[PDB]
Design an enzyme around this catalytic site. Structure first.
Site, short mmCIF file in Angstrom:
data_model
loop_
_atom_site.label_atom_id
_atom_site.label_comp_id
_atom_site.label_asym_id
_atom_site.label_seq_id
_atom_site.Cartn_x
_atom_site.Cartn_y
_atom_site.Cartn_z
N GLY A 53 32.21 18.09 28.39
CA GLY A 53 30.44 18.10 27.80
C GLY A 53 30.74 19.80 29.07
O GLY A 53 31.00 18.97 30.52
N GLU A 54 30.19 21.09 28.65
CA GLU A 54 30.17 21.89 29.32
C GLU A 54 28.36 22.36 29.45
O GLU A 54 28.83 23.22 28.22
CB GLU A 54 31.39 22.73 29.47
CG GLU A 54 31.54 23.54 30.61
CD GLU A 54 33.18 24.63 30.73
OE1 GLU A 54 33.32 24.58 29.27
OE2 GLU A 54 33.43 26.05 30.78
N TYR B 219 23.73 22.53 33.99
CA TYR B 219 24.45 22.37 34.88
C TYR B 219 26.20 22.06 35.75
O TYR B 219 26.50 22.07 37.04
CB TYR B 219 24.51 19.92 34.96
CG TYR B 219 25.19 20.02 33.71
CD1 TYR B 219 24.82 19.72 32.34
CD2 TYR B 219 26.58 19.64 33.97
CE1 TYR B 219 25.68 19.44 31.49
CE2 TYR B 219 26.90 19.14 32.36
CZ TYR B 219 26.69 19.18 31.59
OH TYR B 219 27.53 18.97 30.28
N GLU C 43 30.48 20.41 33.87
CA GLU C 43 30.54 20.52 33.50
C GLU C 43 30.66 18.50 33.57
O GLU C 43 30.40 18.26 34.63
CB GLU C 43 32.36 20.61 32.94
CG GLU C 43 32.93 20.22 34.86
CD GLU C 43 34.00 20.56 34.25
OE1 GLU C 43 34.73 21.42 33.01
OE2 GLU C 43 35.43 20.98 35.35
N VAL C 44 31.34 18.12 32.58
CA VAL C 44 31.91 16.69 32.62
C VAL C 44 32.78 16.44 32.36
O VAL C 44 33.08 16.65 30.81
CB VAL C 44 30.65 15.33 31.31
CG1 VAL C 44 30.58 13.94 31.81
CG2 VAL C 44 29.13 15.54 32.10
N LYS D 12 30.89 13.75 36.72
CA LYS D 12 29.43 14.71 36.17
C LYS D 12 29.80 15.82 37.64
O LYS D 12 29.01 15.36 38.87
CB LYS D 12 27.86 14.59 36.18
CG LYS D 12 27.04 15.86 35.41
CD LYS D 12 25.52 15.31 35.27
CE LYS D 12 24.77 16.39 34.35
NZ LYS D 12 22.99 15.85 33.79
N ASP E 277 13.89 14.18 26.71
CA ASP E 277 14.93 14.79 26.04
C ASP E 277 16.30 14.02 25.32
O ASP E 277 17.28 14.75 25.59
CB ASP E 277 15.56 16.04 27.54
CG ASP E 277 15.85 16.93 26.65
OD1 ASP E 277 15.65 17.67 25.58
OD2 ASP E 277 17.31 17.44 26.71
N1 LIG Z 1 25.57 14.25 31.86
C1 LIG Z 1 25.58 13.10 31.67
C2 LIG Z 1 26.20 11.93 31.11
C3 LIG Z 1 27.51 12.48 29.87
C4 LIG Z 1 28.39 11.48 29.69
C5 LIG Z 1 28.51 10.36 30.77
C6 LIG Z 1 27.10 9.89 31.77
N2 LIG Z 1 26.66 10.66 31.56
N3 LIG Z 1 29.38 10.01 29.81
C7 LIG Z 1 29.97 10.41 29.08
N4 LIG Z 1 30.78 9.86 28.27
C8 LIG Z 1 31.17 10.56 27.13
C9 LIG Z 1 31.12 11.89 26.88
C10 LIG Z 1 31.12 11.95 25.78
C11 LIG Z 1 30.58 12.93 24.80
C12 LIG Z 1 30.93 13.97 24.01
C13 LIG Z 1 32.97 13.87 23.36
C14 LIG Z 1 33.35 14.56 22.20
N5 LIG Z 1 33.92 15.98 23.00
C15 LIG Z 1 32.56 16.92 23.47
C16 LIG Z 1 33.65 18.14 23.72
C17 LIG Z 1 34.83 18.10 24.78
C18 LIG Z 1 35.66 16.95 23.72
C19 LIG Z 1 34.74 15.26 23.91
C20 LIG Z 1 33.26 12.56 24.25
C21 LIG Z 1 32.31 12.20 25.28
C22 LIG Z 1 29.79 12.11 27.76
C23 LIG Z 1 29.24 11.21 28.65
#
Ligand SMILES: N#Cc1cc2c(cn1)[nH]c1ncc(-c3ccc(CN4CCCCC4)cc3)cc12
Length: 264
Positions: free
Chosen positions: A14-15, A18, A20-21, A36, A121
């Site tokens: 995720g991008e 903020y 990116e993650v 993050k 949110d």
């Molecule tokens: N803010 C925040 C945050 C975001 C996450 C987190 C902890 N904190 N822990 C997390 N674990 C998995 C994902 C996540 C989100 C979407 C996906 C699907 N896809 C999205 C587009 C790029 C490739 C992965 C996969 C994993 C996102 C987070």
């Protein structure tokens, strides 16, 4: 044990604004974490709130580190991704899945509210699923303290995401935190059961919102939703936040308690 503090970043999760993650994997253990990464060129508050949080339906915080202008939050990796991607457009998902997700979401929000934190949110993009499809509330970047020393503070900052925001946030200068989070949970429920959002925003200038206040539930999304979950939505998506159902009462609702789904 040598090398145990080394992590490889393997994939972007995720991008946004903020930054990116990333998915990080430990060199030795192969444990996965989400990192993050936020360029300071606010997050102090996000970190502070994250330090307070310990619950099965809330994304776990492991720690943080700052190298120069980059802050690095180390967080629970949720390999199921976002709830957003379990919602089929125009369909939703099977009602028993939605109910289980809704139960978990409520457990997470009760917890938050109990420690005086409002998320502000809630939406399917922020609700993450683990390997067992358990739901986890993520992203406390807009979150804030609404209760401290057993004393409530009223909110006044408009924030959140328009289709999910409660109507009092558009109408009133000050408003209670808890009803706004309840409202957003109602829009999430609508989305899971209909695969569409009911309006652009809850304003007297928005026709779909007017149709709802006039109880035109023969229209979409409401005609797609069974009468039992629909009766709950009628109690959640109430314009007066003082008249809106509270979470202790959602837990007494007939649909909320209706047996639907078998175990894994
Ligand atoms: N803010 C925040 C945050 C975001 C996450 C987190 C902890 N904190 N822990 C997390 N674990 C998995 C994902 C996540 C989100 C979407 C996906 C699907 N896809 C999205 C587009 C790029 C490739 C992965 C996969 C994993 C996102 C987070």
């Amino acid at each position: 044990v040598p090398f145990v503090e080394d992590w490889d970043l393997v994939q972007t999760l995720g991008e946004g604004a903020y930054g990116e993650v990333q998915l990080a994997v430990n060199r030795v253990t192969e444990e996965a974490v989400a990192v993050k990464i936020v360029d300071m060129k606010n997050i102090k508050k996000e970190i502070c709130i994250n330090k307070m949080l310990n619950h099965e339906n809330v994304v776990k915080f492991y720690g943080h580190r700052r190298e120069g202008n980059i802050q690095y939050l180390f967080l629970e990796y949720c390999s199921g991704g976002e709830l957003f991607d379990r919602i089929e457009p125009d369909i939703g998902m099977p009602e028993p899945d939605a109910q289980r997700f809704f139960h978990q979401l409520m457990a997470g929000v009760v917890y938050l509210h109990g420690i005086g934190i409002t998320h502000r949110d809630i939406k399917p993009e922020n609700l993450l699923l683990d390997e067992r499809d358990n739901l986890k509330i993520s992203d406390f970047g807009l979150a804030t303290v609404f209760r401290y020393n057993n004393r409530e503070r009223l909110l006044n900052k408009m924030c959140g995401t328009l289709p999910y925001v409660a109507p009092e946030l558009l109408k009133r200068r000050e408003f209670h935190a808890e009803p706004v989070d309840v409202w957003s949970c109602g829009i999430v429920l609508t989305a899971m059961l209909a695969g569409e959002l009911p309006w652009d925003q809850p304003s007297d200038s928005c026709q779909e919102y007017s149709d709802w206040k006039e109880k035109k539930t023969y229209l979409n999304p409401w005609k797609k939703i069974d009468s039992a979950p629909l009766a709950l939505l009628h109690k959640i998506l109430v314009e007066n936040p003082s008249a809106r159902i509270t979470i202790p009462d959602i837990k007494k609702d007939r649909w909320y308690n209706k047996p639907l789904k078998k175990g894994a």
